[model samples]
Target chain A: GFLSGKRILITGVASKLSIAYGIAQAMHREGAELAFTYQNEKLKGRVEEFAAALGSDIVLPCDVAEDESITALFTELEKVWPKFDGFVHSIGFDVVTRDGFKIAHDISAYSFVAMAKACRGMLNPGSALLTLSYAKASLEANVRYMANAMGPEGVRVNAISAGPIRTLPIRRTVTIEDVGNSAAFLCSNLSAGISGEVVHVDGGFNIA
Target chain B: GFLSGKRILITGVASKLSIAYGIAQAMHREGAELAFTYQNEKLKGRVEEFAAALGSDIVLPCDVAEDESITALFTELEKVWPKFDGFVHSIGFHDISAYSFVAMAKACRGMLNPGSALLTLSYSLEANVRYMANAMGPEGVRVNAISAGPIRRTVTIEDVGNSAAFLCSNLSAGISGEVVHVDGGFN
Candidate 1:
């Protein structure tokens, strides 16, 4: 068990096709005690089912767009688990509207900051934080800043810039398992030396 | 003239088809004064001709495999121009026995200005860019790499040149220790 007895929180699990779901499945296999987050009441049952499948009973509601909601979620987590190893911030959304950029930036980028700040005191020194992103340059810059700020605190921050996947109806190239294996590696001791970098798992499509 | 009044050193130029050669032409078009490095005397005539075409006469001998030669090239460069904006490292060897980037960066310590930028060429997923960026960030030097993807029919050298141009110029001042893939989503 690479992650035996390790406690980890996974957020933004929509379904089996979601990247977070794959990561959850992989981490659970490594003997990790898991907790999960859902956006609203509508999603709570679905997320709870995923949590039950993993033999976990802690599923909390968290809407990262609201500061109070995030604080409340972490407060609940701290009561049950005083200190944890690390977290996987798999929350991101892209809403197409007149303010599409702002919506996307808020949910996809700033939410990580909100979650990291909330988890700051709870994270052990050797803890690792992993996230997922498209090959967007803007998001990569965000990873650099977070890594620089968290490096001195002994928390490694990194992301997986996965190639296009078929999570949607369109035929995809990269598999969920491919990214799941990478997510597992980043959280485990195998990738201890890497921080604030993106591991590409797109099957060499970015180089084609 | 996005790079007007910018002095840039370009190394690892082998021929017209070389990636560095394409960067040189692109930089020259943007008003950058260029200097080049050659492997040995045998290749000097060929490099000199390329330099002439770019309207640059500053071709110096450098064998990056040897530490002293790198030291000498910078020593000679310091006499011609006391300072330079940045450098483009377009040369690398397939054999690990050939060159050392750590030694090259160490030798460049005295030559690089504060806030200077260094761009290297890499393949997709190379860890070289990550480590180099982390080590060099505190010194105010921005280090980045362009990971060119497999040579597909659609991609061209000009795309690589455009990427190099962005990393070397003021536009990418905020980015460091990053590898941008230009492989047409190949990697």
Candidate 2:
């Protein structure tokens, strides 16, 4: 019940294996109301089903690839929550080429900033936003910049390093539940002092 | 003219205002032979014209979007010149491609000469510079980035070019994997 009365909008949950799914389960159990966004229609039915089970009916459509999609999602979300808390972004989009660099910088990194741009006034003081990255400095740097901008507003922004794996649910490595519990705490006031930092749950892969 | 005998590859030269073109000018002025790559046919003629203006006829086609294109670029370059000093990536599609610098470094590994130094112009990414630096260090190829931060008197292309020329040349031999902020700073 740590998240009682807390409203959280979660993105990037394609299946039960997603880190966002585990975070949703943990946050929901702690009494947080959740909203969901599926990238496209392919995963809509399943995401909708997952939301219903969590006592949420706020599953909406969002594609962080387009800035317009973010604007539209928030427009729709505002109609429902009006003045809510924050969001969790775990969207994974690819590559390392020119198009890859653009995609990496745009969807992988700037999407969180774009969401913050959209949700600027929607959050109250003490509200929090969380994202999943792989200890990626580029993305982490963006989180740092967002922290500075949102810090004075009394809102907190944080990141989780989920590491290089995509959606396989491999064991012996960190689980989504491990990541979920950590994220749940960060979003709550219990871990309130944390912001603009990358909490690595990579099981010591980057412990230099 | 410290770069007199050195031959460097330049990309993303669209016009006179480009940081890469200014770099090409500075490098050409320094006496380094230049080779240029244009992304598509749209800029091929432009790059060819620019390369000629700089007394370079080694304009080749390149599209960093594909691995094959990069492979083919070197393949074509090898036809005349057996080896290269380094390359400059002024080729961002705006404020993105921060990671492309590393991508370019990875693709250029073992191909660059011992004294070769790689430079990228940014208008920003800190991580890619460090990443490329660490990876390319052992290869004896230095990698660094130039970021123009804005304000406190705006930085000009010549300003960035002067820095780029130094990094690309042996004059900046002690510096690698560093980000030289060409934007005039407060401190």
Candidate 3:
């Protein structure tokens, strides 16, 4: 098992179609004790079911959009385990308007900063932080900043701007499982040399 | 204009900060007669202003996102002046994903005449450099780009222009499918 006895915190598992869910399943199969996060109380029910079925009873509440919510989630998380292995931030949304753009950034991009800051104390020297991005223009700025900010601490920060996948809402060439396999590799020690990179898993669609 | 008597079409010049603008200013000072493209009528005035400042009178509207708009732009451009020299594509956005670049590069195959060069701005990533090189090699169209980083002082726009000129000119005729870094060796 690549992740034998490793503890990983996975976020944004709204449904089976969610990329986070696929990552959780992959990590679980590798002997990892997983902790899941739900956006709100409404999602708590479904997420909790998925966690238990996967043999992980620890499911935390985290609304990445709110600083306070993230703070509380970490506080609760630390109580169960003083230190953990890694984390995955798979939350995302689309916003076209001016205000929506800010909110979308907060949830999709800034949330990684917020979460990384809160996890600093609990993260081990070799711990990794992975996030989902689209390799968009804004992403290059943030990934570079985050990798530099956490580099001194021996923590690795990387992003995977995966290609279009076949989710419940949208169907494309990329599969959620493809994203999962890549996520697992990034979280494991196999990707020690990779950081601050946006690896695309879109079936070479971007290169084509 | 070091580009004296040479006609080059520049796309996506929203402001001076744009790489396209830097390339345009470089080519203009080298004596190249330039043509510009705007996304819509709203940006026409700004595009016109920049073109005029550079002693250019051709400002055409082009939307790369739509296939028809691209074909129409070339049609309109041909009516005014046929057989232009080269093109500069610098319009960029977040979230549309890099795949759009591949499609755009493919579409450029017909628009560009033979023996001309195509360039793209890139970071120091190994993947992007090689992917583009392999993708454009078979067409016999020379593809190269500048990958720059910060220097002891600041890298002026002129430095970028100097490099762009070298790549666009016959001096770099033997060079194809390569990325020349100008970041003072920051990589």
Candidate 4:
């Protein structure tokens, strides 16, 4: 229970197969108090059921496509927990009409700008902001800017950019549990000095 | 005329008496489609008039204190122009120092077309400017600042405007980042 007393919000938890879910299970196992968010009605029951299994009932609705939704989320959250130590986050790709795949694509990335600003006061000193990203320009830019913006607040923002795992580089894929453990360490005080950094959690695949 | 067909927003045009107007005028002359912003209700008339004169009626109101206002301006720009070439800020680039510069680039990066240039009327001298340049450089967009010499001394608005217009245009395509002492070496 190394994460005891840490209050974290984990989004993008689709199911047992989700990397987000893996992170949540590890966090919960390490004794962290958690909250959840679902993108729309379709995810409401599924995410709620997952939260319940994690001993949580703080599941809330957030469209991520709208500013008010991201803002209102913090409004309701502040009522439950005055402050938190971390945020783990995503949803992108739907159709081919552009952001039929397009809308989903932007919704996933830009949500953090408003969400991070919204939760600024609620994030404790030494708090961490973690999310999935690519070496892709937009997401990479997000990490550095978010890190710079949140740094003065004593909070840290970072992205995990890993190789697609497995294959000739590492020969075996990294387990979701490995992803979770890596996230936990990053979010904790043990790794406080690093900010605005992209950690490649690939199993030597990227460097190889 | 290198900025021809480019769309750029000019923020903080309090009056024609200021440097922001200089930038707006020069950018418009370069054949760029211009969008404008007023810091508050009080200045909307002037921003509106000047922006209209420059062949742009896409004027909006914004206040830097409220991040929501900045979001509003960005959101509205999204509707009329999907890909903005860049912007000129005569407003609060100093408040958050380099962080706000980085934030501005982050917000504009997705909406900006390649060769987009963010021309803010401010800078942090060196470290942060280089940092921001590299951050936005990979996307084919450029982020830079002008270190104006002084206001009281003799100088035309066109001097600053021409320098700004060039930086925002492809004429200075090789100059991705710098605070070229366009201010008569007064820096």
Candidate 5:
């Protein structure tokens, strides 16, 4: 009963085998109530089917690109529950390293901002805002902007670079699923003191 | 003749007392040609009056808020000198001790992208690429970025004067094992 009666928003669920879906299953087992957002109308059927399996009926449509849509989604959440315990932003695209320069810089740059807005609703007392990210962002050992910007808020902002865990479509990279369990630990009272820091749960490969 | 015929661009020049302007003056003394970019038209006149004293004519405009402005600034520089030795990026700002839960978060989120853009240019554009394009390249032109060190230097973990001395010194012995050793592994 760790998350008994708590409400949480988990975004970036795209497929049945999406990494975030794994997080949702684990959170549900812990007694927390859940709500989720699908990327758009096309993906709604798949996400709704997944939500039904998890016993969650609070699904809203959201696209992190549009602040208006994100804002409206949160507004809807306010009606279902006055406050939420936390949120998990398990979203990132392969536009950076693989797709070349512009998308890497622009979208990756803006996603951090969108995550900040999408998760701000959970920054109240005893609440947290969690996101997923790669070790490349942290391993360079540069911590000025991201850490400093999110520090003043009562909300705790941190990330899990869960190594190269391979899912269904992600057939070929070495990853650590156990790393994701760390997200569960952070969401709990155990991580009360931490915020504005992103940790890598990936195996030592990221360190290299 | 240390900086003879070099072209340099400087920003954040508020007065004759500013650090970046001081660098500009020092470089000018060493025989480098200079240019300055004021943030807006209001500061434009001020920078011009001071920059004119140094015999500079390359003062094209730049506004960092727009991504293209940086590209445009470099394009104009290329048009003038086509191939210059190096440039300097000296600018930073934050409202002192400003604290708020929401504002702090806003600043925190804003901090990642914009400051990253500046710092990346501070090192990558101002230091690395210049060194790559001019200093270490086939021509051996020796382009470099002189990041000003305060009496208390932040990155080097030292009090500022020594940090400035560290940057100015050509000898490698003054650097800590941590920095020198790590840099050696790459360089």
Candidate 6:
């Protein structure tokens, strides 16, 4: 139990196959008390089963778009704990109305505005905030504005911006597991010197 | 008259020796129709002196941080040329409160907020559509952000002279290179 007594909040859990779920399971095994969010009611049973298997019992429903929901969630958490050590903001979208189409249209301004708003609200000093993203920003498309906006905070805001892993969302393309080992290496004290930077988990894809 | 028929707006000109003044002078010799902004009423005389010397008629006061002032300044420009092709966002900051030699105890939270704000604003170049896109959408304007590196071997505070010249010039387009490292190879 390396995480004998630590707590963290993880947003963006869709199911056992979700990216956040993998992070949750990894963090829980090391000994941290965890809380998760499911946007709609349909995910309640799925999340419960996954959470119960890990010997945990705290779950909350959250939607990232609406501000009031964020305010209320934080307020409630304030009553329960003194302060949260860190949080993982694994949320993203390119929706139909605000976000856009399946292949990523202007939906939600390409997810940069909402992502910044969420990162700003959830982060405070001495708090580690993590987000998930891809290598598109640093390369030509210049689409990684969301991560760039959040970089100035100087907190522990690191994303693995992995290249095509076999997760449920992206498993259809290619499912490799080597990236997780590098991510786990980052989670350990091996990367204590890192902060406000993104490490690419893709195998020479973005670089070349 | 290299910049013949080109329209340029120069902001943050406070005195004859101001950095923006040098830019205006060079652009004028190249035949640019220039505009200047006096950040406040006190410096109006100094800024106006330089603008008049260059034969520039479009001297207007602007405060970029305020949304309304930025909009108003552009509105007036629209009346003159109907729309301008390009402009530069010459901005930077240093907070006096963020640094101290005597008060070490209370220095934990100092003037770093503006620096963070600087990076955040620069990041919005491609992030916010309204900031760069909408401002240029009316006249088919294109905006690009230049993250210039320290020009000298290493950096001291006041040596940012070469960078502004380089970005404002046309040499960059040949490379079409993103994140151009003009660090004088210091990096």
lDDT score, residue B101, model 5? 13
Candidate 1 chain B, which ten residues in sequence have the lowest lDDT sum? B92-101
Model 4, which residues run further than 4 Å from truth? Answer: A94-104, A134-139, A165-172, A204-208, B1-187
Candidate 5 wrong stretches, greater than 4 Å: A94-105, A118-122, A134-153, A168-177, A204-208, B1-187
Ten consecutive residues with minimal summed lDDT in candidate 2 chain B?
Answer: B178-187
Model 3's DockQ score: 0.02
* lDDT against the true structure, each candidate: 0.73, 0.74, 0.69, 0.70, 0.51, 0.47
Each candidate's fnat: 0.00, 0.00, 0.00, 0.00, 0.00, 0.00
Count of steric clashes across candidates, in order: 13, 0, 9, 3, 11, 10
**After superposition, candidate 1 runs with Cα above 4 Å error:** A94-105, A134-139, A166-172, A204-208, B1-187
What digit string (tens of lDDT, one per residue) describes model 5 on residues B131-180?
23221222221122233323111222121112122222211111110110
What TM-score is obtained by chain A of candidate 2?
Answer: 0.87
Best by lDDT: 2
Q: Is candidate 2 or candidate 3 better by DockQ?
A: 3
Per-residue lDDT of B117 in model 5: 11
Model 5 reproduced share of reference interface contacts = 0.00
TM-score of chain A of 5: 0.77
Which candidate, 2 or 6, has the higher TM-score?
Answer: 2
lDDT of 2 by residue, B15-130 (tens): 87777898899788878999999888999888898999998999988877766778788888888677889999876533246655566666666568886888887763344676
Give a tens-digit lDDT track for model 6, residues B29-133.
Answer: 656677777777888888888889999777776666555666666667666656342444444453221111112111211221110111010202322312332
Q: What is the C-alpha RMSD of each candidate to the true structure, in Å?
A: 18.1, 19.3, 17.3, 21.2, 20.9, 20.5
Q: What C-alpha lDDT, on a 0 to 100 scale, does residue A130 get in candidate 2?
A: 92
Candidate 4: which pairs clash? A98-A102, A99-A102, A99-A103
Residue B184, candidate 6: alpha-carbon lDDT: 22
| Two-chain DockQ for each candidate model | 0.02, 0.01, 0.02, 0.01, 0.01, 0.01
Local accuracy of candidate 6 as per-residue lDDT tens digits, A69-137: 665566666565545556666666633456534343433232334434543555544344456553444
